[PDB]
Amino acid sequence: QISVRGLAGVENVTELKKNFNRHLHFTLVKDRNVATPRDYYFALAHTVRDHLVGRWIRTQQHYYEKDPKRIYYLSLEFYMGRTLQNTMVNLALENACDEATYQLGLDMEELEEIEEDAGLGNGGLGRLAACFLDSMATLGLAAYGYGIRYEFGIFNQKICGGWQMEEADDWLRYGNPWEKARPEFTLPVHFYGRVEHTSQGAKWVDTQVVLAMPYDTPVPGYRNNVVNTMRLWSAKAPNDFNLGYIQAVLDRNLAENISRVLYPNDNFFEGKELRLKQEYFVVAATLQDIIRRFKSSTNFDAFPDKVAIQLNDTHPSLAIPELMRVLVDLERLDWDKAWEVTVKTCAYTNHTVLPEALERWPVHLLETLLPRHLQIIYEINQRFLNRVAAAFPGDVDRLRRMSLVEEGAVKRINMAHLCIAGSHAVNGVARIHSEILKKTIFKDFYELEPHKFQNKTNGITPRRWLVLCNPGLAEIIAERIGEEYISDLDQLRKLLSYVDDEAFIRDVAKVKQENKLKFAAYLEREYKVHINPNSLFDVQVKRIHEYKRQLLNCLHVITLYNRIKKEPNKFVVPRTVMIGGKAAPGYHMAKMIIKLITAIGDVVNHDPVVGDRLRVIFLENYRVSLAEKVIPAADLSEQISTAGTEASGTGNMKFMLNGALTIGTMDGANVEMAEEAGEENFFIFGMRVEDVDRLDQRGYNAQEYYDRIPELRQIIEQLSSGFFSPKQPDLFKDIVNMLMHHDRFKVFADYEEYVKCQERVSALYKNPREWTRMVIRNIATSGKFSSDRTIAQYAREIWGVEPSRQRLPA
Amino acid sequence: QISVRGLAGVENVTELKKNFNRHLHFTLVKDRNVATPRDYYFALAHTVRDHLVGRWIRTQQHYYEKDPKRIYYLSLEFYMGRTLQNTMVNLALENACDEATYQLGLDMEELEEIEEDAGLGNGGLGRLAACFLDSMATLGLAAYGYGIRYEFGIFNQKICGGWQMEEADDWLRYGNPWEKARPEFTLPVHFYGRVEHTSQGAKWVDTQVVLAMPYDTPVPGYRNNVVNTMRLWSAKAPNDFNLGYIQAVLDRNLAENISRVLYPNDNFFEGKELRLKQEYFVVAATLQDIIRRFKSSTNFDAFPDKVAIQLNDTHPSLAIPELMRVLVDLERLDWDKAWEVTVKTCAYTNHTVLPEALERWPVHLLETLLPRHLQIIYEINQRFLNRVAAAFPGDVDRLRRMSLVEEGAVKRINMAHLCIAGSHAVNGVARIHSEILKKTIFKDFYELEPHKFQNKTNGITPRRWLVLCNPGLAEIIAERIGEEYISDLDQLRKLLSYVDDEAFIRDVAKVKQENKLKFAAYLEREYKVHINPNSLFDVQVKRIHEYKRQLLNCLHVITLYNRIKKEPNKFVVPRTVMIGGKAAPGYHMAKMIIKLITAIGDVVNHDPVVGDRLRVIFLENYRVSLAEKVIPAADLSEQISTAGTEASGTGNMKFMLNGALTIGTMDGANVEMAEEAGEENFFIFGMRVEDVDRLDQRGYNAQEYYDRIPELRQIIEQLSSGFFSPKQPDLFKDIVNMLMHHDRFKVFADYEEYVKCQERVSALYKNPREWTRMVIRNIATSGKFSSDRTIAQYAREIWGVEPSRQRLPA
Ligand SMILES: OC[C@H]1O[C@@H](c2ncc(-c3ccc4ccccc4c3)[nH]2)[C@H](O)[C@@H](O)[C@@H]1O
Ligand SMILES: OC[C@H]1O[C@@H](c2ncc(-c3ccc4ccccc4c3)[nH]2)[C@H](O)[C@@H](O)[C@@H]1O
Ligand SMILES: *Cc1c(COP(=O)(O)O)cnc(C)c1O
Ligand SMILES: *Cc1c(COP(=O)(O)O)cnc(C)c1O
Secondary structure (H helix, E strand, O other): OOHHHOOOOHHHHHHHHHHHHHHHHHHOOOOOOOOOHHHHHHHHHHHHHHHHHHHHHHHHHHHHHHOOOEEEEEOOOEEEEOOHHHHHHHHOOHHHHHHHHHHOOOOHHHHHOOOOOEEEOOOHHHHHHHHHHHHHHHOOOOEEEEEEOOOEOOOEEEEEOOEEEEEOOOOOOOOOOOOEEOHHHOEEEEEOOEEEEEOOEEEEEOOEEEEEEEEEEEEEOOOOOOEEEEEEEEEEOOOOOOOOHHHHHHOOHHHHHHHOEOOOOOOOOOOOHHHHHHHHHHHHHHHHHHHHHHHOOOOHHHHHHHEEEEEEOOOOOOHHHHHHHHHHHHOOOOHHHHHHHHHHHEEEEOOOOOHHHOOEEEHHHHHHHOHHHHHHHHHHHHHHHHHHHHHOOOOHHHHHHHOOEEOOOOOEEEHHHHHHHOOOEEEEOOHHHHHHHHHOOOHHHHHHOHHHEEEOOOOEOHHHHHHHOOHHHHHHHHHHHOOHHHHOHHHHHHHHHHOOOHHHHHHHHHHHHHHHHHHHHHHHHHHOOOOOOOOEEEEEEOOOOOOOOHHHHHHHHHHHHHHHHHOOOOOOOOEEEEEEOOOOOOOHHHHHHHHHHHHHHHHHOOOOOOOOOEEEEEEOOOOHHHHHHHHHHOOEEEEOOOOOOOOOOOHHHHHHHOOOEEEEOOOOOHHHHHHHHOHHHOEEOOOOHHHHHHHHHHOOOHHHHHHHOHHHHHHHHHHHHOOOOOOOOOOOHHHHHHHHHOOOOOOHHHHHHHHHHHHHHHHHHOOHHHHHHHHHHHHHOOHHHEHHHHHHHHHHHHHOOOOOOOOOOO | OOHHHOOOOHHHHHHHHHHHHHHHHHHOOOOOOOOOHHHHHHHHHHHHHHHHHHHHHHHHHHHHHHOOOEEEEEOOOEEEEOOHHHHHHHHOOHHHHHHHHHHOOOOHHHHHOOOOOEEEOOOHHHHHHHHHHHHHHHOOOOEEEEEEOOOEOOOEEEEEOOEEEEEOOOOOOOOOOOOEEOHHHOEEEEEOOEEEEEOOEEEEEOOEEEEEEEEEEEEEOOOOOOEEEEEEEEEEOOOOOOOOHHHHHHOOHHHHHHHOEOOOOOOOOOOOHHHHHHHHHHHHHHHHHHHHHHHOOOOHHHHHHHEEEEEEOOOOOOHHHHHHHHHHHHOOOOHHHHHHHHHHHEEEEOOOOOHHHOOEEEHHHHHHHOHHHHHHHHHHHHHHHHHHHHHOOOOHHHHHHHOOEEOOOOOEEEHHHHHHHOOOEEEEOOHHHHHHHHHOOOHHHHHHOHHHEEEOOOOEOHHHHHHHOOHHHHHHHHHHHOOHHHHOHHHHHHHHHHOOOHHHHHHHHHHHHHHHHHHHHHHHHHHOOOOOOOOEEEEEEOOOOOOOOHHHHHHHHHHHHHHHHHOOOOOOOOEEEEEEOOOOOOOHHHHHHHHHHHHHHHHHOOOOOOOOOEEEEEEOOOOHHHHHHHHHHOOEEEEOOOOOOOOOOOHHHHHHHOOOEEEEOOOOOHHHHHHHHOHHHOEEOOOOHHHHHHHHHHOOOHHHHHHHOHHHHHHHHHHHHOOOOOOOOOOOHHHHHHHHHOOOOOOHHHHHHHHHHHHHHHHHHOOHHHHHHHHHHHHHOOHHHEHHHHHHHHHHHHHOOOOOOOOOOO
């Protein structure tokens, strides 16, 4: 139907049709008379998977022969979403599969909606790892993603009586056709035990053993016939485990719980033993695999020439002392040489400066679970602090600040400090964030070793986040500038020569309108809600958090409502305000914010005086598959975190690529997006980082803003008095108390500038032609935010390997 | 190579070769350069499985159209063993697969040894269900086996220092290619809760829900293109189960433990809550499936015309009150009509008279777990006892004896009494056993309802237990009488015309010798043990139990040893005595017997004076796959249970079919085997049932036998004094104390007659021609013991359906 979806040749369609029928019969054991849509989905997935196999085997054989430097991306999270459409896109099979299923009497889009998201992450950090895997394959890098195969991913969110309820995400119930179990490559992982010191070194003995069984998932590059691997470990008890008899077998669950569930906290550290077990499990199993592959390529001097390990935050930080343990205790390298190898192999990416998100593990947990690792960490610390002392003699406070061991009531290990000491490179994820690291939390480290610190601004894959989710936009672009931009997104700059082209303006606007109609329909059918498709679609989708300031959005919505009620017969630009995101189950304030948003909806959406001028919708169960629907439909992207708190953001980039304008603070990558597009084509408001620092030095007093801004006082009085909760008038007192007396994120300080900036948005939306011209200027300068650009920078500046667009033969 | 293995046509071999390679590539994601024997096994299994699919779909569609009466065989145990060879045999693919793999450079026998046994049973009762499924398919019955898919089957037995150790049987680790998950047909099962009485009947409310997810396994008939289904249920937690957050997800294991492990007790009842949950789980899920299929065929009067439910012992006895519950509480049938339907639908097979094996559930467990069921059972009991009272007025002790409720310290429900009340037919499993039921434990029931009581003597499938395990024997038979006997085993009677044929005598003896050499080699390679292949192979393989009297065998072995030591230079017929079997993990005496057998081996096998005249081997990890190796190699089959204790036995029948002579008591089916072959062709010894009864009336005094039999006194003194345990002299005191003071099974009473009968065996073995002529007379009269004969009798006399040998079209 559309060009970018590839060719539908007769021979190819014929072959797909017969393989579909073959799988339905032999694989699924069904005939057409009793087959359901689910069976049809599975038959199509198996048919598409068959096309990955030859490329997968040949890619991995190619790495074996050529022996390139291998890149290992370690993460506790991979937020993959659905795989079927992505696979078709990357192998150029979408139009052929569409035609094949059409001829069989099936709608392929209907079949696509049956697939479960692979939800093995919380949000941005997990989704970054997934875009990175897509880019590494597209750039021909010999790359492996290593993680945990959680039985249960991020919970499914239900809203009941306006409140979040959680349900287990049993994503594997119907089977996962994309993974291949590899029980033959199962490896042992050790826990507990004790250290014995002998004549020939330390020995870690009396341990409990858990097995790590790998499942491999293919990761296709974009039309280059490269298929890399994501290897996810599953925990298994050994067969003699605990071996009355029945209890012993049932107690195998204690070992197997390690891979049962994803911790569901975004940007929040919870120091639980089970989480520490998960972190060591992935690290221990992965490093054995790395070393095996390296020996099957004595001379560990070449290890850093053949291996790069990238740590996605500190969560796999135990890779550093585990590598030292293997090299020292098992391979019998001297300490200094092992440390040299480790440092040159490891690199660390930091994704946050929020104190509560930083990993600081109690010494007593490490002492019990990983006694040899604690010893190694102590030794790392002593050697590091001897370097600090030599560089900064007499500076005793620096020694305390830089230590990997934090003193106090309970001693803890600072994992970020460990990562910096043991990595040859440390990066932040946007320019402003990387600057903050050098000026604030990692200042002392930067002074000691300035050469270690880098920036790598984040990106997103334009396969999933344009071609897959917005084929209509992708097509009208390819009509003008060809298809090369899909793997070289900087080519979107050529669209600037169309900003005055009347045909292009019309088409860009038509595609948004079509996306908005489709989304409005999806709402009605799947959630029985009726939105005005001519209204401005104002969207804030992301995890619920105080720092992301969904609360500031709420204050604006209430302001708009109150202004309408004051002057009902005055014209205002109609808005549909959509907010979605999951709250961590234990995060009380985030749960209260969800309830506030639905309560505002309950009042606003049923007030006859408002009509269809203002609607507020809470989008339930926000996840990767829902992002693919709502992002192409958005007009306005809300990116309104307190300056200094969002390390980068990536949702921001997805909206930019899909034809929404951004209202935002100068935070994370928003700064670079405004720089690329031009500040005139961005709706920037609020305190900069320097202004936040100034307020903090003076002392933030929320009462001042309440006292001076009548519209803000009205809202707080409505909240406190029970206007949005008539049957429970004190329901939102926690929210009010926080706003007035202990708001770390300064919601009131940005309120006036936010409201005024939102008026400017509404004014521009009244002029469709000029709205759309600004959109074209955003889409055209979105090229920098391709994760292909990001990964090429890691490759050249950290990993020491050259990217390639050259195709392997099929 | 051999005719009974079918044809190897070029087209067929060509197609198998290309499907093997296809599966290795696309299914396994391997190439030949890194593929291991395991991968090659899996590629062959998938190739063979593809041939089942069309036949499976067409068989089930045929039942849907024709709507025959359906037979549901409910069991907690299905001891299936390996599936690959059986499937090839039944589809006539063995020679073609042999040729195909030969041409690919592989040995198919090597590939066969990689497959795990499906060990979902303890021994005879579970293996009976498996032979029955094979016969039902071969006879064209519309039959379904329903059970539990245990994650862990019967434990793997290791012998360490002469003692049994248990290891979990993680049979699913590498995947099971023979099953198909059917998550779409998942059904809810209820537990706990309470009963509410309303205007319109009882309601069972406030229950906990566990889901039952079915996995289907095909069951091919022998060369008739029929493929029936074995449906096994797996327990799953609902997604809102227990829904801090992490604990709630981890606690899902509480629900899922129901299907985790097989209780490993043979002929012993253990009244544990988890076992009761397993029994209700299989019953509740199965009956919903039965009723669904019946409605998709209001009028439950036709239910018994369209459904037969066979209860494999009392373990699925809750089917009776569950069916009443559904009919009364849910379908709103009046009690009397529901009871009529239930009785006509259900039939019960009893497999034991041992008191400790009989299920008697505490009322307090049922009251908590299954409150509505207890109420229904009370009501069944009251109505039944009103019938007894009308039939036998004033006989108050009969009312107490017949009650389903047993009074005492703790009240219990007698499940056998429940089954008799609620079944239109009750059978034992061999003629002597069925007679004992009517004379002893079920006498009162037989007096009330004589028409209910039947016999169905057990059998074994001659596909697995001749053609598969002993192709050499199968071939030399088919040369003389053709191939029809494989599905009509009574045709073996034609072999009586060859008992004087010198060529046949030679061939029968050659095949045994070849089987013995092969087994002797298997021992050496897999267990480094060196046995004399010219010796008499004297074999007792079966679960370890006091009633089976492995101890009596031990006394004979020690007698033979002592007699050799007394007269070293006298000639005796060389013997290899092999004993194998698993002990239940909590059965202390059975564990002590294993240790005794290995301790006797330690002394005997290293005494230079004995040489290779006597060897004693304990065969580790006895299971279906090992039975298939050792049974064709045996000369003498030991079937020596105390008369009245082995309900039937089935190992006995396997040995008879495979050319061993039997030494045995007149117990279970041994009686009928002697009757078929002629008493002159059987080595019968010992007390009959009547003699055991006489001794019990007088009082069994073991001391009498000790006092009168010097050879027996010598053995006991050796045991007591530490002759077989020099470093722990009192090691076997428990065994001695039991033998002397509390032997329920009268080991000493049968000792003299056993030893004398064993002398007659040795005398006949010295004459190879006459040995072999007696063997031919056994093989020739083994026809009655085909499970095809058994199932035809159930079909005609219990289920009301006619068997068929007519082939469905392929
Ligand atoms: O670089 C990708 C994204 O990483 C997010 C991110 N940083 C830290 C986390 C995090 C995620 C999961 C945890 C789990 C346990 C403990 C701490 C944890 C921290 N997540 C940032 O908020 C985005 O601005 C950024 O765009
Ligand atoms: O009919 C097949 C075989 O059934 C065996 C058998 N009877 C009862 C059992 C049993 C098996 C498993 C349990 C588990 C729990 C409670 C009781 C349990 C009872 N097993 C008999 O011993 C054989 O003589 C007979 O050949
Ligand atoms: C991109 C994405 C995120 C990150 O969004 P931010 O606005 O950068 O926090 C979170 N969740 C999902 C499902 C995403 O696709
Ligand atoms: C046949 C069989 C049994 C039953 O043997 P008996 O001698 O009748 O107790 C037990 N276990 C296995 C593995 C079998 O094949």
